[PDB]
Structure formats: structure tokens, C-alpha cells
Curated annotation (Swiss-Prot), chain A:
Biased composition (Polar residues): 47-57
GO molecular function, one term: structural constituent of ribosome
Name of the protein described by the UniProt record: Large ribosomal subunit protein bL35
UniProt GO cellular component terms: cytosolic large ribosomal subunit
Region (Disordered): 1-63
Curated annotation (Swiss-Prot), chain B:
One matching Pfam family: Ribosomal_L20
Name used for this protein in its record: Large ribosomal subunit protein bL20
Record's keyword terms, sorted: Ribonucleoprotein, Ribosomal protein, RNA-binding, rRNA-binding
Stated family: Belongs to the bacterial ribosomal protein bL20 family.
Functional note: Binds directly to 23S ribosomal RNA and is necessary for the in vitro assembly process of the 50S ribosomal subunit. It is not involved in the protein synthesizing functions of that subunit.
Keyword rRNA-binding: yes
GO molecular function terms noted in the UniProt entry: rRNA binding; structural constituent of ribosome
Gene Ontology BP terms: ribosomal large subunit assembly; translation
Annotated S-S bridges: none
Stored PROSITE patterns: RIBOSOMAL_L20
RNA sequence: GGGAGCUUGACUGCGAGACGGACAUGUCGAGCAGGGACGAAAGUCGGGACUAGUGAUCCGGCACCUCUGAGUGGAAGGGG
RNA sequence: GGCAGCCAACGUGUUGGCUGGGUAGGGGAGCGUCCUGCAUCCGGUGAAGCCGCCGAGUGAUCGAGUGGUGGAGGGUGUGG
RNA sequence: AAGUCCAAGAGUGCGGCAGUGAGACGGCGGGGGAUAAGCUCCGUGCGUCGAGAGGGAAACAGCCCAGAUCGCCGGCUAAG
RNA sequence: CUGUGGGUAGGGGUGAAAGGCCAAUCAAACUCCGUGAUAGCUGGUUCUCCCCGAAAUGCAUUUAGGUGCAGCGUCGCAUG
RNA sequence: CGUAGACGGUGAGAGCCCGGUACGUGAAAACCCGACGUCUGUCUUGAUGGUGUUCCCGAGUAGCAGCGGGCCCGUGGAAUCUGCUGUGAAUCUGCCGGGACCACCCGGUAAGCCUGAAUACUUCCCAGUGACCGAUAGCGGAUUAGUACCGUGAGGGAAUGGUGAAAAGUACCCCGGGAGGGGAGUGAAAGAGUACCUGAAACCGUGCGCUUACAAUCCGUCAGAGCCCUCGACGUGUCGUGGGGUGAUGGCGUGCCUUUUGAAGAAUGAGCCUGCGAGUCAGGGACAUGUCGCGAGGUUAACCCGGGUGGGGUAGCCGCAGCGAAAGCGAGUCUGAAUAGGGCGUAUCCACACAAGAGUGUGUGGUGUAGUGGUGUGUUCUGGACCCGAAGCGGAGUGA
RNA sequence: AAGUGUUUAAGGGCGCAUGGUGGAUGCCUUGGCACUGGGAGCCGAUGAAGGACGUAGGAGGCUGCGAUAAGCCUCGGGG
């Protein structure tokens, strides 16, 4: 039985060239009128997964 | 590869039963009940082996105190005087002298009394 | 000689199995599981986080699409070309595969900035600007085929 | 804090550096476009005196885009 | 006096000196059992098993030491 | 700045493989209670028990002394 | 009231109605199978020794006796 | 000497004793596949390769609509396939598919069609094999076994192997009603007597040694008086480096396990012994830790051949690169109307320059980057997944 | 004159010896389990699968076989 990858984790996380798992940031989907553009710029782009969550996110991506 | 565990089990069972040989009741017959007592037996052996030194020192001290007071001196002042005189005879052999060589014990008592200060209670 | 009884594993090769739950002198009783709980009798799923929105559900799904028609290329660098063909000569997909620079059946894209110093007739599916510049400076010929 | 002018820093759109606080949150120097004030005078001042005034993800909209377009001369059918 | 990591040594690195209560738990190293590749030993001049004696090892445990019963297998080494 | 000097078995980062996420009492600083509870809830590079034997507290997890590598017909002490 | 022979069968029967009875079992009989149901809950989990050695906290939680992460235990890096 | 040492049996390890084994080989009859016959339709009776314009040629079907099913596709933009309901196409300028459509097109010719062998499984039969079990195991079943027994029924469902080489199975006598014994005999052995290989523990006796009826005991442990045997000085009982027991008496001493803040706990479990009873296995699964091969390469999967574990097998997989949502380059890329300003990447590490003290950059040279396949162990994934345990749920039946 | 003083075991404990019960252990096997390679892959109104009752000189079970009843005929093999 092949280890199935977690669909949600695969859709929410990516690995860079060096293997860094990257993710997008929450609170940037709607309710944006009250959010200053500095906040949305902070929430923009991709950030490396926190070391605490890295183990479980790797588990979900690999199997 | 089915393995029957009698050969391996009976080894420790015989060990514990032979060790508990002499125990009263189930403790000498049943391995499980012998094992409980064997735990206690060996814990007690360790504890009493540590405490045997204190028990024998207590016996020696009691005998030395008896001999000292027979010689008209307390045990504490006898030890103080022996230390002042530099006599390094342990309490074991002090009790051995007290029993087997009372004359030698009296000589040591005289040495200790001579080495004691002129006034044991002096502020010195 | 070496007979069968002279064969032994490499030092540090084999390791004893951790036979758990065999007396208290080893990982006994609970077998490394500790006292009561879920984990005392089963494995907690990796995606479970105690009931709070898991990370893989509170984080937004990555933006974009995958483009099932993407034309990805197997890349060759002119530095690898130099190492593989110090004398020069014609270069194409066949001999790139032979030298082990690309997959056997793929669209090869040549490229590079690693000081191409050999006249080479390189025939790949595509080239980069620096690939063409390096080929020309070295005196070779880039051909997209 | 209280009044006044500007005419819309109503300073917005692209934002190295640093940081404070697990995700989330929060601070701003500074560079560029465009402007607002003040101009002589400087070249200076990134929502509200500051901390609450909010709700992840999913799923859907709605505007714009140099993206995609399941053979395509090509379009319609998804994304940013 | 006996046993368990690091340090110095000059040379084959095994000697000396600085070191250890433990539940969950982690790491290391082992005892015993069975089945097996190969090697080699013991066995109706008595295998195993069992009951002892005498002992032995830091532990699991040991017994190519030994007596009794027994009647056909077993030990050791290195691997699986 | 030094001190700890055969390092603390130190701190940090990354991968270990975890269990733990019911704590208890005692001293100090407090909340609730009646400034009761062997009460309850906090803080304490505070302790101990948990997970800690040994000695003293008559007995007596949490107090006091003191952290058990093993032996000894040794010695000195701790609290008492 | 009774004998004999019949009929009604399980979410169904029968019930002068008590959830009564339906083979000593009934708020949904029994047997087999799904099936080794599932249980964050109890219980059990078997040889040894050497080294180290916790936690009972924070945040979150359809969460509060569960769990995720962090804190705290366990080899190799850098560090002297 | 064996072209036959496979495996068994035979009074204990047998190639040469026997059944056999390698291999001299064998079928009347019956049943299975081969060659030649009788037997079975189509032609020479002008087709057959070329010529050419025009007419005719597979239906309640395709399509469509509603409601469903199934496809990665859970109704979605929803194609292809399909059930039911309704409505319903011509003849190649047709029709259908390419996940709408002009069509540039390509592919194919459904519904009237139908029809082939080459891959799964084993009740049964034959020959074999096992780092499978070996009588609580292995099938429930080595034994009356689906039997006994239980249940009205469906159904549930056991326990029970070993004398010896050979019954040689103990004649005869004695005690006894017998049973059971004692002589005697058989036997290598009755320390093999149809209660029978060995014969453990629990449990139950009998004999001997010490001890114990003034004593308060987690039943032990440390001292320890008193009561027998192994070598000798000495010559004879008191010593010893010596060597086991029994335990008057004294000190200390609160079972084990689980679970707890904490249990000797008057919390849980255990009457005892023996046997059994719980982290195991599958998979190129996933994540981390020694070895082959490289040199950027590692590997094969299915499969083929081999009487094996061996040889082939490049499909694929992983490395080989990245940034991007994609289009784009390449150590670059993305964001950016703004050679304006940043993230992710260019292994790593040295040196020399230019910018910098906002703490380090930008170039230049030099070392050239290490992943991969087996098997290493620990975790983890999907499976019951360390083991045991519900009440209850469903399907099919059995019961008045 | 006072004081000292071994000496019993109804029973029990411990140990050793010697037995019984029991059926563990060891060594086995007539039996299972998992497979491999082949055969055959259907039987039945010409009465199947499966049975009840019978059947041998003698009681019953299993086996075989059906009033032709541990059996009848033919053809082969073997001695």
C-alpha cells in the first residue's frame, strides 16, 4: 500500500529548491477593507513553515 | 518457529526456589510467592549488610563503655583521651581487649586518662 | 579460503530488534507508551491537532494552477558541456544522454554561464541567451531542433 | 487639547533594513512612482493621542490582467 | 579493595589519573530459548529432559564439572 | 572581568525517538474562603516527594540532615 | 379451565395494555455472518544490566481524565 | 567401487539388510492429442485489373429534455458510457468522437448485427516441498469428530497420541471375595506391567535431624547460643582461611502488581502449580541512522530464460535546477509602467579586488557539489496493527 | 539454708531422604498448516450430492458393497 499524500497539505505547502517548506499566510482572503495595505503586504507572499510545524507538514506532504 | 518457554522459565524458577529454600509456608514452595519474599529478602540483606557495620560498632561501643566504667571512666572521655594520646585502635579491637585482655584495656584507660586535659570541662 | 562460516555482516550493519514489553529491564510493561491515553492504545493521526483547525486547513491553499500542458525542459549547462566534451565536436540530445547530462527521452534545453571554452555544434530543443552567447564566443553553433 | 487654510498624505501604489510577539498579531527607518500641505525657510511630515471597534480555511462571487485555453486557423470552458 | 565515560602518555592504545539514586522515557550492551546456512565436536563406552552435589559470573544466568534417573539426540563457533 | 579547568555532563541550532500535559505538601508573596480547611487558584534558578533509599522527626510521601556504584565485624561527622 | 392439531416472527407478532409475553433472555428474541465492530475508557503487555533521565506547565481544542504544538528527557554539529 | 550416499524401515547414525532411489523398461482394456483415409461447401460456367457520370443502400435507434447510475470527476463548465420517462433524426454534402461551436481539421463508421483460442480459481486426484505445528500446538477434529454433548431450532461444539525391539502382556505359588499386591518368571531395563517413554511443579504422605506449648511473627534479613558430617597438628576432641544445616535469643523490617499527589494499605488483580497468553507481518510505502556501485549516476517493475538463490529485461523511478500561477529565462527567476527599489534559488569553503561599517555585500578567480539501489534498526502510513472487553448496529435465517 | 539447672511434642515449622498423585519437560508421530508442479475442472431423471436401512459365521463402530449386498463378470498386472 503506497503512502497516500495528504491532499490539503499538498495544496497548502510547497518545497523550495533547498527543501524549505513554504506556505501562504492567513487573514488575506476577505474582510480586507479594514486591513491596512501594510498588513496585507505582510500577509502577502510565502513564508517558511515554522520549525514546530515542519515535522508534521513534512509527514503530511510525504505520506 | 514455535518456541516452548519451559526450558527458559524453569531456570529462574529454580534459582528463586533454591534461594528461598528454608522459608516458611508458600515462600519456599511457590515461585511467585518465593519471588515476592526474595525481593524482600535481598533488599533486607543489602540494608542489613549496610547496617551491620553500625550494629557491630554499637556492640563494640557498649562493651568498651562497660569496660571503661569498670575502669572508672566514661566511654566518651575514654575516646577523647585515646585520641589525645594518639592511640588509633578501632572500637572493634578496643572491645576485643575489653573482653579478652582487661589488663591491656586498663592500660589504655590509664593512657587516655593521662592524655585527657587537666579539666575536661575547661573553656579550652 | 573464505567459506560460508567466515561471512559476517559489516561492523554496525545489523542491530538487534527492540523487542518491547519483555520485562522491566527493557522497555517493559507499557512498552514505551507511558500511562493511559489515546497513544497508550493507538496512533493519533498526523493531521489531527486536538480539534482546533489543523494547519493544513487554516492555511490558505497555494495560489495558481498547474498547467497540465506545461513544456518543461531538461537543462544542460555549458560548464557540463565543457567537462563532457573537452575537445569540442558536435553535441546533441544523443550524446548529451550518453554523457549523462539529460534524461534519455526529453526536451533538452541548453544554457549556461560557466565559461564555455570549446567550439561545439550544440543541437538542443531550446537555448538561453547566455547559451547562445557562450556558444558563439567559443566559436560553436547553436541549433534548435 | 482648541481654532483656521489647503483643497483632498483622504500617504496612496511598488516597500532592503531591522525588529517586538507560537500561527495569528504588531512597529517603523528608508528607496521609487504619484501626488497633499508648508514654502521664503528647510526640504520636512506613511488614517485617527495610542491599545478594543473583529472571524481562519473552504466554497463561492464581482472588477481588472502581458496567465490558461484538453488537436487547433481559433475561440469558448480555469487561474493571478 | 572491586566494577562502569573522558584525559595524559610514549609507544601497537592499554596503562594510569579525573567519573555512577531513579518512575515515564530515550540510548547502549548483553543473558536465556527455539529453528536454521556453514565449520567443528560429544553421544547406547549413554544425548536431551528432570532431581541434586560442587562450585561460577557485575546481571539476565552458567556447568565440554560432577552424581542419580533417563533412553537418542546434543554442544560449541560464526552467521540468518 | 574572572570562576567553574581529565569541562557543568552546561547553553544554542538541526534531526533523535519519546512521555508529560490528574500533581502533593512545606517555606515565602498573594487572590477566593471566615484573611477556616490536609481547601482552592496563582507566583517563587524556592525545597522536597513524585521518581529518593539512608539517619532523625515514637510510628509518620512532601519537615530536618543527607542524594544509595559494590564490599568491609575500620574511622569522622550531619540532623538529632 | 383444559387436551390435541393448527395460525400470527422481530421494528415484527400477540397484548382485557404490565413495555407484558414471544423457549429460564425482551424499551426490539435468538443463531450465524459483516467481525478480530468500535470504545479519547478499564485491564494486561513476559529476560538482564550500563549511561542519561523527565512532566504533571503554556497555548489551542465539541476541549477539560483526550490530543497537537511548545516547555521539560534522550546521538552526531558549532563551542571551547 | 556409486552412471544410483533421495527418503524411509529394520532391535541405536545403513549407499552396499528391506521398501526403494539413478534408471532395462512396461498396458489387454478404457480415456485423452497426433499422420493418412471415407465424410462435409464453394470455382473454373469470363468476375478480379483498370475505365468512368448518375440512381439505391441497417430506427423508435442516434440526438435532445427530465430524473438517476458510473466514470479522478460528490452536478460541477460536465464531455464519453449507461437505466427509466418523454420527444425523436438518412444513406456519406450522412452520422459519431476528440471533455461547446464556423469549422482548419483529424479519427471512426453506432444503433439489425453476431461471433475465436491465448488470463483468474481448486471441491477433487497425483507427485512433491518447508530456517511450518508437533498433541493446551497444528484443522474444530492425530483418538467415536462435526462425533459426544448443548440447544425446540438455526446453530454451538469438545476432551482423549507414546509399554516394549519383540506381548515375550507376568505361567506357577501365596495374602486377598475381588481389586491390589508379595514371591517367581519375561525382558537390556517392570527405575517399561495394557493405570504403561521421560516423569517437572502444584498437591498428598511416611522416615530421620534441629526446632517449637510465657508467645503478638509482611513470616524475611543481619547478628546469633545450642544440637551432625568432610583434611590435619596432636592422639585423640579442640581447634580451622576451611566447607552444609536447624534456629533459642537480639536488632531492623508496612506483601507483589496496577493505578495514583499519595497504598502495607480496609483501592484494583491474583487460591496454587504447569502449559498457553500481548508492538507482529505485507508493501521498490514515508521519515531518520553502517555497506555495492558511481563519479553524476544509481536502479530496474512486469516480463523472458535457468530444475535455485543465476543471467537478461531502460518501461519507469530518484538524482541531474531554479524561479514563477502560468508565459519566460538560466543562475537566475518572480513581484514589479519605473537599468527604481525585495523573496525563492545559484552545495560548500578559500584567496584578490571594489564598495561597507546598516554587520556585510558585489565581482574575480580557485576545491568542484552526491545522490541512488539493496539490506542495516527506530518511528510512521493503509490493513485487526501490541493484546483483551462492551452495551449495541446491520444482513440472512431459526424459533408460537 | 536460697539459688542455678538440661529433661516432654498434643500438634506445628524448616530441611534431607523416600514415595504417591499429576501430566509438564525432552525426544517423537498416525495428524495438521502453507505452498509448488501437474491432472481434472463438473455430477444428476441412464436418478446426482448426500444419506436411511441392510449386508461377513458370530454383537457394534469405521470401511466396502446393495436382496447378486466386505461382494458377481470380463480383460490386464503379481505371484
Amino acid at each position: 500500500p503506497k503512502a497516500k499524500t495528504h491532499s490539503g497539505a499538498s495544496k497548502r505547502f510547497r518545497r523550495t529548491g533547498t527543501g524549505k517548506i513554504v506556505r501562504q499566510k492567513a487573514n488575506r482572503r476577505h474582510l480586507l477593507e479594514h486591513k491596512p495595505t501594510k498588513r496585507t503586504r505582510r500577509l502577502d507572499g510565502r513564508t517558511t513553515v515554522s520549525a514546530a510545524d515542519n515535522s508534521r507538514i513534512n509527514k503530511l506532504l510525504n505520506g | 518457529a514455535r518456541v516452548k518457554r519451559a526450558l527458559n522459565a524453569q531456570k529462574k524458577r529454580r534459582t528463586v526456589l533454591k534461594a528461598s529454600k528454608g522459608y516458611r509456608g508458600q515462600r519456599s514452595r511457590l515461585y511467585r510467592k518465593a519471588k515476592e519474599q526474595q525481593l524482600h529478602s535481598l533488599t533486607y540483606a543489602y540494608r542489613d549488610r549496610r547496617a551491620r557495620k553500625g550494629e557491630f560498632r554499637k556492640l563494640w561501643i557498649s562493651r568498651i563503655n562497660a569496660a571503661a566504667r569498670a575502669n572508672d571512666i566514661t566511654y566518651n572521655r575514654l575516646i577523647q583521651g585515646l585520641k589525645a594520646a594518639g592511640v588509633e585502635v578501632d572500637r572493634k579491637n578496643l572491645a576485643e581487649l575489653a573482653v579478652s585482655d582487661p589488663a591491656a584495656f586498663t592500660a589504655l584507660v590509664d593512657v587516655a586518662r593521662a592524655a585527657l586535659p587537666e579539666d575536661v570541662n575547661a573553656p579550652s | 579460503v573464505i567459506k560460508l562460516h567466515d561471512l559476517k555482516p559489516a561492523p554496525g550493519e545489523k542491530k538487534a530488534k527492540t523487542r518491547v514489553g519483555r520485562g522491566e529491564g527493557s522497555k517493559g510493561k507499557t512498552a514505551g507508551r507511558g500511562t493511559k491515553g489515546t497513544k497508550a492504545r493507538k496512533n493519533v493521526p498526523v493531521m489531527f491537532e486536538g480539534g482546533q483547525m489543523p494547519i493544513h486547513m487554516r492555511l490558505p491553499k497555494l495560489k495558481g494552477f498547474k498547467n497540465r500542458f506545461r513544456t518543461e525542459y531538461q537543462v544542460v549547462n555549458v560548464g557540463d558541456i565543457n567537462k563532457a566534451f573537452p575537445q569540442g565536436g558536435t553535441v546533441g540530445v544523443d550524446e548529451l544522454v550518453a554523457k549523462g547530462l539529460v534524461r534519455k527521452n526529453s526536451l533538452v534545453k541548453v544554457l549556461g554561464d560557466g565559461k564555455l571554452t570549446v567550439k561545439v555544434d550544440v543541437t538542443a530543443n531550446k537555448f538561453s541567451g547566455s547559451a547562445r552567447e557562450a556558444i558563439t564566443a567559443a566559436g560553436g553553433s547553436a541549433t534548435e531542433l
